[PDB]
Amino acid sequence: LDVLNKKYSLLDHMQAMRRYLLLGQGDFIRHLMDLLKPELVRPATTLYQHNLTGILETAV
């Protein structure tokens, strides 16, 4: 258990399993969806993955 929680960082993954997926941080995910408003308002015909994977980085 000792080598697992530091060499592969088991606990840190749980901590960010809460913060991001369960919104357990809240701030970063709110700044995502604030910036993600024009794209989600747009029809998904003309949405492509480069626009999502770009704006996520500006957020981070």
């Binding site: 919104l23 357990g24 809240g26 701030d27 709110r30 604030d34």
Partner: protein, 420 residues
């Protein structure tokens, strides 16, 4: 998001300085702007990032016939920001007329930081009612930012001047500024100078050095107002998320204050909740009932006794709310602030809508009616004559605030489904 804070007047600049100094104390930063290398949290809530571990705070200071601004100026807390925004009668018309001519250059100073700010949420006004030079000037500038920005939020921290008595034009100034406050402001945080004087005489036996200890209480409330934003919470990490529940309609947008110690020279969250219900612990002084309450706790976390306390404040039955609506007092939990020593590790804060302040408004209205009929208290200067030859704008202001009192008393009733 990001909020540019806006201070004018003598007292308003004092709270702007005091709040920014207290935020320097709260974050792990030097008073010179340098961030500490022994420091998790956010230090970018209101701060422009320079390089030298410099988060330059985003605050614009304004002055008119400056006295106390010079004493603010010579300080080690003047090296944190000051992007060179200093720019130079005690009536409302004095501040209004003097702001009239110079509005463009101070608004250019505003637009400077506006394009400087990539992100924006709101503008916070550090105002003082019947402060003389602050009155008129602040309402004029409030009209200008509202006219220029229909996309932004405005919250005003303003004093209610009542110290049980000399200035005789005070109800006139408060009447006009409150007219601008009702129709040109999105958010109002009001406090009683009398109630803070009462709590100051509670915690000590001072009468002369009241101002500095008043600064202590106001800095506590102002820091507690922003703790959910400056430290990562989960909801009301924006101004608007905090604001939206509190205002059911923009005639009811005046917000109440609370701080749970009386003297600041295990208790569960229920106890501070139940006494934050008490009006002896509220810092602002038929039956009045709350329209919506939100409470905020920062300190020791009992993970299940929250809902246990919730059932308890229910069945206590100390506060019955608005009849014609689903009005709840609502719970927020935040982190207690690191990087500073703290007495009273549990600390509470209430934001609410209550109908009790309509009494204070009709007090000012009745005093204004008395002085207006008695006709010796407008003090007849060239400012007021050039502003209005016939002085009907004050009459219109009294009419509108009387209409607002009528709206308050009609909202006080169990039936406010019909208009008025």
């Amino acid at each position: 998001r990001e909020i540019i804070t806006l201070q004018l007047g003598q007292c308003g600049n004092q709270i702007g300085f005091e709040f920014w100094k207290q935020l320097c104390a709260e974050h792990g930063i030097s008073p010179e702007g340098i961030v500490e290398e022994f420091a998790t949290d956010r230090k970018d809530v209101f701060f422009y990032q320079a390089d030298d571990e410099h988060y330059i705070p985003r605050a614009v200071l304004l002055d008119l016939e400056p006295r106390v601004i010079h004493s603010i100026l010579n300080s080690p807390y003047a090296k944190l920001y000051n992007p060179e925004n200093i720019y130079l009668g005690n009536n409302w018309a004095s501040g209004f007329s003097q702001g009239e001519k110079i509005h463009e250059d101070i608004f250019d100073i505003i637009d400077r930081e506006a394009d400087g700010s990539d992100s924006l949420e709101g503008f916070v006004l550090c105002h003082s009612i019947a402060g003389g030079t602050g009155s008129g000037l602040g309402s004029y500038l409030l009209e200008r930012l509202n006219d220029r920005y229909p996309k932004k939020l405005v919250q005003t921290y303003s004093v209610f001047p009542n110290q049980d008595e000399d200035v005789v034009v005070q109800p006139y100034n408060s009447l006009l500024t409150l007219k601008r406050l009702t129709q040109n402001a999105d958010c109002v945080v009001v406090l009683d100078n009398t109630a803070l004087n009462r709590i100051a005489t509670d915690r000590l036996h001072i009468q002369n050095p009241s101002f500095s200890q008043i600064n202590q209480l106001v800095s506590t409330i102002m820091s507690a107002s922003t703790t959910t934003l400056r430290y990562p919470g989960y909801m009301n990490n924006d101004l608007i998320g905090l604001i939206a529940s509190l205002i059911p309609t923009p005639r009811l947008h005046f917000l109440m204050t609370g701080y749970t110690p009386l003297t600041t020279d295990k208790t569960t969250v229920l106890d501070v909740m139940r006494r934050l219900l008490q009006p002896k612990n509220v810092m602002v002084s038929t039956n009045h009932c709350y329209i919506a309450i939100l409470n905020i706790i920062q300190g020791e976390v009992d993970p299940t006794q929250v809902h246990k306390s919730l059932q308890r404040i229910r069945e206590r039955k100390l506060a019955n709310f608005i009849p014609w609506g689903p009005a709840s007092i609502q719970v927020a939990l935040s982190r207690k602030s690191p990087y500073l020593p703290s007495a009273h590790r549990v600390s509470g804060l209430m934001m609410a809508n209550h109908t009790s302040i309509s009494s204070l408004f009709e007090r000012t209205c009745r005093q204004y009616d008395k002085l207006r009929k008695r006709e010796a208290f407008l003090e007849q200067f060239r400012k007021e004559d050039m502003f209005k030859d016939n002085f009907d704008e004050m009459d219109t202001s009294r009419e509108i605030v009387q209409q607002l009192i009528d709206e308050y008393h009609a909202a006080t009733r169990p039936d406010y489904i019909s208009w008025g």
